[PDB]
Amino acid sequence: TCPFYKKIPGTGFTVDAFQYGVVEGCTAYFLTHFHSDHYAGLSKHFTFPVYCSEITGNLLKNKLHVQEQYIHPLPLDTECIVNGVKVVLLDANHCPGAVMILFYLPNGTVILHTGDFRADPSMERSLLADQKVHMLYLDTTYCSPEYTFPSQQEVIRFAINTAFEAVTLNPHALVVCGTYSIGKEKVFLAIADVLGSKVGMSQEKYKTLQCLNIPEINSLITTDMCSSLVHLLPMMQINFKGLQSHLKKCGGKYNQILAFRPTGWTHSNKFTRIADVIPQTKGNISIYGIPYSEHSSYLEMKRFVQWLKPQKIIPTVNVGTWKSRSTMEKYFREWKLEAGY
Ligand code: NI
Secondary structure (H helix, E strand, O other), rough: OOOHHEOOOOOOOOOOOOOOOOOOOOOEEEEEOOOOOHHOOOOOOOOEEEEEEEHHHHHHOOOOOOHHHEEEEEOOOOOOOOOOOOEEEEOOOOOOOOOEEEOOOOOOOEEOOEEEEOHHHHHHOOOOHHHOOOEEEOOOOOOOOOOOOHHHHHHHHHHHHHHHHHHHHHHOOEEEEOOOOOOOOHHHHHHHHHOOEEEEEEHHHHHHHHHOOOOOOOOEEEOOOOOOOEEEEEEHHHHHHHHHHHHHHHOOOOEEEEEEEOOOOOOHHHOOOOHHHEEEOOOOEHHHEEEOOOOOOOHHHHHHHHHHOOOOOEEEEOOOHHHHHHHHHHHHHHHHHHHOO
C-alpha cells in the first residue's frame, strides 16, 4: 500500500505515488522528476491530475504518452493554487525538470518535500528564506558521513582535460559516455564541446534530450553516429565486451576508446582524490568511473537541514531497514543538538 512518507497530511495530495493503483482519497498526484522509480506506473491510461514542472510535462507527453488534458505543468518560483492549497515548485539541483515542492496547509503548517535533490547554498536564497518550514520530507540517499564527493565543477574539469589530452595525442580515439536516465548531461556535453564535436546517440535518447529545454541543443547533439566522436551508449554496454563490440561497428574509423561511467558514490571516495583517479584498461580500451553526483553529500545535506531548522524530518530514502532508519534518526538528533533548534 502507499507508504505514509508519500502522503501530504491535510490535503488530498500524494508525491511520487503512481504504482499503487488509485490511492483512496487522492485528488492530485505530484511528480517531482522523470526518473523511473518515481514515475513508475504512469502511462497513456492515467486519468487523474498530474502536477509537475514544464520539462517533466514534456517527457510525460512525449515519452510516456500521457494525455495532455491530465498534465498540469507549473512554473517555478511562483505561488500557485492547487485544489484550494497554495504550492510553490523550486529547483531541486538534481536532473533536468526536477523540483522540490512547498505546501502551505490551510491550518498554517508549511511542508517542504525535497524530491531528489543535491543541496546547495543557493537554495538558502530562494523563496524558502521567507518563512518557517515545520515538516521536511528529505532525500536521504547519502545520509552517512563516509559519503564525500567532489563538486560537480571539479569532476567536469577532470573529464574535459582527460578527454582533450587523449584525443589530441591520438586523433583516431573515440570517446564514449554511459547513460540510463536523464541527468548528468553536463558530462557528455562538456566533453563534446572541448572536442568541437556533437554528441551522437540513438533516436530514443535524442528524443528524450529534445524534451529538456536546453539552450542551443540543436547545435550540440545528433543521431548521426559517423560524424560524431563522442558517443552515448546504454550504461549496460560500458564494459570491455560491449565496447570492443561497439568499436567493430565503427568500421576502422577509430583504434582506441576512452569511456566514462558517471557513477554515484563508490568506496574509492573514502581514499582517493579526483586528481588521482585511474582507469581500468584492456588493450586499446580505457574506462573511467567518475563520481558525478546529483544527490547531496552528507555535509551538503547537513548544512541545508541545519539552515532550515525543521521541527520534524521524514526520510524518503533508505527507509526499508530498521538499521538505516535508526542510524538516520541519530544523525538528525546530532544535527539538531549541534545547531540548537
Ligand atoms: Ni532521481
